[PDB]
Each structure stands twice: as C-alpha cells, then as structure tokens.
Amino acid sequence: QPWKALDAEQALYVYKRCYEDHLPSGSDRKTYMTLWNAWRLEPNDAITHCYAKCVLTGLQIYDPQENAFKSDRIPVQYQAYKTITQSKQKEVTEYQKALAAANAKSGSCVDLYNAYLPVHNRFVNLSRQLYHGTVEGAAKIYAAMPEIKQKGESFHAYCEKRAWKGNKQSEWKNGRRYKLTGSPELKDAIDCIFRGLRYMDDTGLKVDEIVRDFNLINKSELEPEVRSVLASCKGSEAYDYYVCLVNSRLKQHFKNAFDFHELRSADYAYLLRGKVYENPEKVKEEMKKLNTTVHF
C-alpha cells in the first residue's frame, strides 16, 4: 500500500481526460492546444488553471484528500522506470526539493497553478520523462510492458485475453456479446473492463462515469434513468452493475454507450481528433480500422 508509480497507459489516460474536460472547443481551441501540447502552462487564466489542477491530480502529484503536493512520489515514479528513461538521479532530487517547497494553499485551481508553475518551468522536460509525457518515451515503456493495455487495443479486448487464458474457450470467441452467463471468467472480464473504463475503482462504482458515456452517445436526457437503475442494483461487483444495466430498459443504449467506449478505450485521442459519435455501424467501422496497418 505504498503509493505505486503510474505506467504509460495510466499517464496517457490522465492526459487525454484532462484535454477532454478542459480544452476549449471551436475557434478558441487552437491557442490552448498549441501551448498545452508543447507542455506550456499558458495562458495564465481560469481555463489553464483548472487544466493544470486536473493534470496534477491525475498524475497524483497533488492529493486532494491531504490537500498537499506529494513530492515523495517523484522518486517513486522515477525508480519504477529509470532503466528506460535513463533520467538523471541528481535532477530527480532537485525536482523533489523544488516541489517540497511549493504551497498548495487552498487547493483551488489558481492556488495549485500558482504554486506549481515555477516548478514546472524548471523541470518540465524531466517531468515529461518521468510521467510518460512524450510520445517516444511512452512508446519505450509500452515496448518494455507488453502486459499493459497498448495503444490501439480496447480495454474490452485486453480484458478478454486475460480473463479466458485457460482451458475454457472464450465466451466471446466469435465476438464480444452481452450474454449474462454468470461465469467466473465473465465476472473477471467485466471487473477488468469496468476498472479500465474508470467506471469503478477500489472505492466502488463511479456512477458519473457511466452517465458520461450516455452523454457521449447523445443520450444525456436519460441520466436520471441511468442513476435510478444503478441505485436500485443489488450487489457491488462490476458484474452486478453490468447485469442491472443489461437487464434494464436501458439495454440498447447501454450497449451503444459501452461499445463507443470500447472504441474510445483503444484510441485515447479519439474525441480530441474532433471525432464524435454517429451510430453503432460507424463505431464498428472505426473498430475495423484499428486492425489495419495504419490503425485508422
């Protein structure tokens, strides 16, 4: 239960979710995107302050419960990958010192941005090495970590391979299905998928993430129904919730939402490319493109 370092998939998840939730859309996007993609924490405004708090929280450099910067995680993040990044121990120590000096104050977006900015300006490139913030550096981690979910591979596919590893044939051998067989392998696959989609963690179900997936297939008016189905669900395991959703009158919409998130979990950039949901047939087409030489 010491804090554990984040691998490439975990960092890439944070970066794409913080773009989704903070990057402006439309005509003002290009200025923010060009600065943030270059790891420049500019301009100094509320949009950027909340983005910075999102990235610091996701990388677990800021802990909201303690309301503190966790400078002791910097050397832990470095130790886990140091044979791949080859980052310099002396610089890692300096980054640790600098972050230990910062004051989170109230923990508000602007307090975190103001405390972190001088540290960022000094250690930005090292931080991109440590937290898999470059495409080439993260690619080395994925090469070294064939066991984590790869770019282009959906969590539903990754979890299926792990769940039916044995002598039992996969239930999804001619394609993933919504059949509720109650098998140990299915319960295992569903837990792994719900955790990869951030529907669940050790603290329990995150209803707002399932609702988010309904919003993303243009069904936001069903939010109350989603909440109601999950609130009356008995059992606490991922498979229990999946069962309630699949048996409910939301079945087809949930299938569409979970299928779109399959696509989105294989290509973490999907919504940032400007792509949106269209219909189930288009999701299938886009999934087929992932299994081609160029992957799109």
Residue numbers in the entry: 2 to 297
Task: Show passages lifted from the paper.
In this study we demonstrate that AnSt-D7L1, a two-domain member of this group from Anopheles stephensi, retains the CysLT binding function seen in the homolog AeD7 from Aedes aegypti but has lost the ability to bind biogenic amines. Unlike any previously characterized members of the D7 family, AnSt-D7L1 has acquired the important function of binding thromboxane A2 (TXA2) and its analogs with high affinity. The crystal structure of AnSt-D7L1 contains two OBP-like domains and has a structure similar to AeD7.
The ligand-free form of the protein crystallized in the space group P212121 with one protein molecule in the asymmetric unit. The structure revealed two OBP domains with the N-terminal domain containing three disulfide bonds and the C-terminal domain containing two. In its overall structure, the protein is similar to AeD7 with an RMS deviation of 1.82 Å over 239 Cα positions. Rather, this region forms a predominantly coil structure extending between Lys 169 and Ser 184 containing a β-turn between residues Trp 173 and Gly 176. Along with other changes, including the presence of tryptophan rather than leucine at position 173 in AnSt-D7L1, this modification acts to further fill the space equivalent to the biogenic amine binding pocket of the AeD7 C-terminal domain. Most notably, a histidine residue (position 189 in AeD7) that forms hydrogen bonds with the phenolic hydroxyl groups of serotonin and norepinephine is mutated to alanine (Ala 190) in AnSt-D7L1. In the absence of ligands, the segment between Leu 291 and the C-terminus (Phe 297) extends away from the surface of the protein and forms a β-turn between Thr 293 and His 296.
